[PDB]
Amino acid sequence: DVLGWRESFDLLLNSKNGVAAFHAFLKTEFSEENLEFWLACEEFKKIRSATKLASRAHHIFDEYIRSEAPKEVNIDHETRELTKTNLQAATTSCFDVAQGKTRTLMEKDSYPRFLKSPAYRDLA
């Protein structure tokens, strides 16, 4: 299980202990919103009902995407505008670009540092 976390970021994100450990690592450097947003996108795509999709999409946008949002993720204006536009036309891949940018924010920086920290090394 712990081996999978370094073989694939996707395996780490599907692990109960992995996610908990990584969330704590991120919280100490004020970037846990990246992980919370990613996970929120994953549950969003499982929604079938049009009404729930609309409601959840608006909450996700207001909580993580719009300027000055409580847990605003570090995305450029280009992506924020794109997401809003997608929100305007109700598309299921509404958050794809934002999720991918946020994923890279983790995968190419905090993820590798997490693996080289006691939080991961002690569990290996």
From Swiss-Prot:
Modified residues (Phosphotyrosine): 111, 120
Membrane topology: Lipid-anchor
Signal peptide: none
GO cellular component annotations of the record: cytoplasm; membrane
An example molecular function term from Gene Ontology annotations: GTPase activator activity
Keyword match Transmembrane: no
Subcellular compartments: Membrane
Keywords: GTPase activation, Lipoprotein, Membrane, Palmitate, Phosphoprotein, Signal transduction inhibitor
Distribution of this protein across tissues and organs: Retinal; also predominantly expressed in the liver and pituitary.
Summary of subunit composition and partner proteins: Interacts with GNAI1 and GNAQ. Interacts with GNAI3, GNAI3 and GNAO1.
Protein name: Regulator of G-protein signaling 16
Source organism per UniProt: Mus musculus (Mouse)
Gene responsible for this protein: Rgs16
Residue range from the parent sequence: 57 to 180 of 201
